[PDB]
């Protein structure tokens, strides 16, 4: 089932322990592997004591739809994973943010949903968890230890985030109009005006493919195609010590910019390696992360490298004929 990128699932020994601010793209990935980022989100926003993801890690998180394709690739980054790396922000839920029906919000402490204008998260505090509907957090004595399993987390939709190639606004307007033409029925998506209607049905579930292009709102699609290109970058690689764990920034920088470390074939054909010296010792090894590559989508005659792309459930209001 998926598997960790670098670091196995955590076994946390104290719920009051702190969440350190590590600086390397490997230490960050390791914290992602162990759901340290989602636990931090809980501590800040929902005033929550402890860690979520004990012994499970990111790989044991629950998805909706549960048959989640991207999950099978450990390298593909969920909206929370991009949050921990700075690529985007998952906002704290407000009253207006509509909780979509269909997922199994029961016992969940955290769940995350891509919205039409961004990414939103709902949390529960200490000793509480979500009721069947997801509208309320209520006392849950099975959440009392503060060292909670990974299935308490719910990531909605088959989403995968990456480094975009920025697009000019003229391209965004082209792509925004084409989506409007393709979904003329829709009035609002997640409260954001999409078409001009003057008569709107009540909010309704909406399953749609979308893409984050780095502008105000996502662009939803019906007819699109995808292609998983392999484009080498530094973030294609994580560097690790086989027993110490993730390496430090200065070490990993020395690996990726100085050809001083070791690693698998693709890394050596990017940065540089060496062998025939290691007697017993220990030196950082760098390996390729497990993903098909960077995703490129074709839509409206144009071809874009998005920040995030996936098929999730948003809330849309339709026309009243």
């Amino acid at each position, epitope marked *: 089932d998926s598997g960790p990128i670098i670091c196995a699932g955590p*076994i946390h*020994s104290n719920k009051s322990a702190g969440i350190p601010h590590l600086l390397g793209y490997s230490e960050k990935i390791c914290q992602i592997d162990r759901l340290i980022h989602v636990s931090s989100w809980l501590r800040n926003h929902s005033q929550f004591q402890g860690y979520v993801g*004990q012994r499970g890690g990111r790989s044991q998180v629950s998805y909706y739809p549960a048959e989640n394709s991207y999950s099978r690739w450990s390298g593909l980054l969920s909206p929370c994973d991009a949050d921990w790396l700075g690529m985007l922000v998952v906002k704290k839920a407000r009253e207006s943010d509509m909780i979509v029906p269909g997922p199994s919000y029961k016992g969940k402490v955290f769940f995350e949903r891509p919205t039409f204008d961004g990414y939103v998260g709902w949390g529960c505090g200490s000793g509480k968890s979500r009721t069947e509907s997801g509208e309320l957090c209520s006392s849950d004595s099975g959440t*009392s*230890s503060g060292l909670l*399993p990974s299935d308490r987390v719910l990531w909605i939709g088959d989403v995968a985030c990456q480094l975009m190639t920025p697009i000019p606004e003229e391209t965004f307007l082209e792509l925004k109009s084409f989506s409007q033409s393709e979904f003329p029925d829709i009035c609002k998506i997640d409260g954001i005006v999409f078409n001009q209607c003057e008569g709107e049905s009540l909010p309704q579930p909406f399953d749609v493919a979308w893409m984050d292009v780095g502008h105000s709102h996502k662009i939803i699609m019906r007819e699109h195609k995808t292609k998983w290109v392999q484009e080498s970058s530094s973030k294609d690689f994580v560097c690790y010590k086989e*027993g110490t764990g993730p390496c430090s920034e200065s070490e990993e920088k020395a690996c990726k910019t100085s050809g001083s470390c070791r690693g698998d074939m693709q890394f050596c054909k990017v940065a540089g390696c060496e062998h025939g010296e290691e007697t017993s010792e220990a030196k950082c090894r760098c390996s390729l992360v497990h993903k098909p590559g960077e995703v490129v989508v074709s839509y409206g005659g144009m071809r874009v490298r998005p920040k995030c792309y996936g098929f999730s459930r948003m809330m849309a209001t339709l026309h009243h004929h």
Partner: T-cell receptor
Amino acid sequence: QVQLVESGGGVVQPGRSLRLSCAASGFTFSGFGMHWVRQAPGKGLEWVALISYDGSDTYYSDSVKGRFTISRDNSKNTLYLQLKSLRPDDTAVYYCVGDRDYFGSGFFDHWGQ
Amino acid sequence: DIQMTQSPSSLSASIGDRVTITCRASRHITNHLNWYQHKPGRAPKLLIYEASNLQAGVPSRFSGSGSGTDFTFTISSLQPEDFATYYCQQYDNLPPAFGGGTKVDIKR
């Protein structure tokens, strides 16, 4: 505040079945994994079994696997260990143990008598 | 699976001395190790978790260190109550394992 009151011990003969119970007070029992650790005369400690907060996850040592069954009623705040097919190797003192996380990961924090 | 080995089996030391028990794990368990004090009649007591952390309410003379396979438990200044048997326990693999132990006697 956090106490564990064991009961059920006695004199049973080889091939008989005893039942042990561990009443837990002072903490939210349903949110913590529990253990059973035993110590035979003249020997060291030996972990026996563990149960998760839900009861959904159980784990046993090799020396007792298939004979001893660990269970918990989280509505009465008591932990159980069901002994079967008992043997002279099992002659020991049986301690119940409270853990720190949802599962019984192996932090033997608060014991019984 | 994982078989812990402690050394020495026994150790005699007088009050005020430094007592350094060592524990060894057949495989790498990172820092998933605990240390326990057991005295005759009374139940075991948890001193160190994660191989270096002090349990709440335990004197600062007790310590712990190590990661990987080789670990250490040290009493900086022995006290009369500190005479008991001590155990190390791994929790990296789901079957938890106690080492053999180490009894602490008093030099006379």
